[model samples]
Target chain A: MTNRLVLSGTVCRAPLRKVSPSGIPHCQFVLEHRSVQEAAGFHRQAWCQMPVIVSGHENQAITHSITVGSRITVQGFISCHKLSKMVLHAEQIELI
Target chain B: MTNRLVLSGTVCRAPLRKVSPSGIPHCQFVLEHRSVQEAAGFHRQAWCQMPVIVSGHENQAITHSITVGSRITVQGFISCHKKMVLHAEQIELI
Candidate 1:
């Protein structure tokens, strides 16, 4: 019933906290995942900048535990909009 | 907690059935999802030919319901193995 990707990566930065124009609490951050190294020494990295909206007013549910350089296992999907480059929309994120 | 992607698309063809070296039952099929049209009119499509390993001997569970052109909402993850190209691995495919 749900399609998603399981990626193990390190947090690129602190979750960029913000509020939507309509006053929804949201956070945006970059996720860098490294796959197998290619033949030319170019490691494959599928970089995902995820925008996660905290629902139910559970702001404290998210913490600095996901600070920059923390290892995490993320599950989310791709979201592409006209003006916004393709980004990963995370439904749930947690520190590993 | 499960981290997965939700995609709705049409089945490109019948599930390409196969067995792993240890006799594990697996099926593979292509999933094509369309996104907003780009400036060049090229719609975004991340072609994923998923290889689903049906555990518990539920072979009959996957059938013509996923026939050619049938609409399905799949949840899976990417799997890239040497000499096997890249593939989507479906965990709990309903």
Candidate 2:
């Protein structure tokens, strides 16, 4: 069982920051991605509108810089959300 | 945009091999993965039944030894086709 993902895209939704009762912080946004990758020796287009969340106090500072139109790379694990879709839980995120 | 993923799981479905009209080979299968991951310093269970495909002449033989219950780690980029499918670049048997 393994799930590790690294994705870079533009933030298409404004980040909503919240703090849990225990003080853990979470920053959530939607990322729009488009790229070209090879498959079966042929060029293919890749696209997605992924939901991303940066949690924990460690990344709260950097996540504060995220907003609509911000370009960033997120390194994290992908997990299901609401039993219907996948969400990226960022361990590290960089805006560039 | 950049997209990359590495996932290891048991092959839950039989591999189906096919050749395109242009002669490229394709092997398709479904992988079932379940594991615990950390989120916000909290442990959360992650599970998915991912559709995986290994394509091209270079990796054609890799699927030969694979069958249902075979465990492997697949590394690749993903493209959306109705849903996302992993476009395998490398596979590791484990």
Candidate 3:
């Protein structure tokens, strides 16, 4: 089961860091992506509003400072959400 | 800007081979993915219904014999129509 995703986008939502009951911390934000991809020899514009959640304490230092309009790149995997929308489990976060 | 996606799933829709008006042959189908992936050391169920479009004549060959329920892996970039979709750059049949 290979599911990997890499995307570069802007933070569209304010970053929220929370501590779960188990003392594990996570952060959540919305990433807005726009780019042009060449497909079939034609350039197609690509866009996505991704709800990204970065789990584990390791990511806290980096994700804690994200703000709206912050441009960044995220590399991670995808998992289903209870709301039937796609959520990106961001394991790697970096500023652009 | 960078956008890349890699996934393995079963074809939920029968492969539709078509030739664009521009003379490009392409293939389209829906992929259904289900697996458990771990995040923060916790296992989580991961699932998605991906609409995949494979363009370019060379890439279209993989879709020729594919049907619904065919398991395969696709690696490529994504473009959004209703949010996001896979435009396969390469595929491997299992």
Best by lDDT: 3
Stretches of candidate 1 above 4 Å error? A35-56, A83-85, B1-6, B11-68, B73-76, B79-86, B90-94
Q: What is the DockQ of each candidate?
A: 0.13, 0.70, 0.72
Clashes of each: 8, 0, 0
| Fnat of each candidate | 0.20, 0.78, 0.67
lDDT of 1 by residue, B1-94 (tens): 2234556656675676676676655566665445442211224333334333232244345443466776666543333342112233332233
Candidate 3 residues lying further than 4 Å off, grouped into runs, are: none
List the TM values for chain B, per candidate: 0.57, 0.92, 0.91
Candidate 1, residue A62: the lDDT equals 58
Docking class of 3: medium
What does candidate 2's lDDT look like per residue over A40-85, in tens digits? 6678888887788888878888776888889998888877644357
Candidate 3's residue-wise lDDT over B1-94, tens digit each?
A: 8889999999999888888888987888998889888878889888998888888878655678788889999998876664568889889897
What's the residue-level lDDT of A26 in candidate 2?
82
Whole-model alpha-carbon lDDT for candidate 3 = 0.86
lDDT of 3 at B60: 54
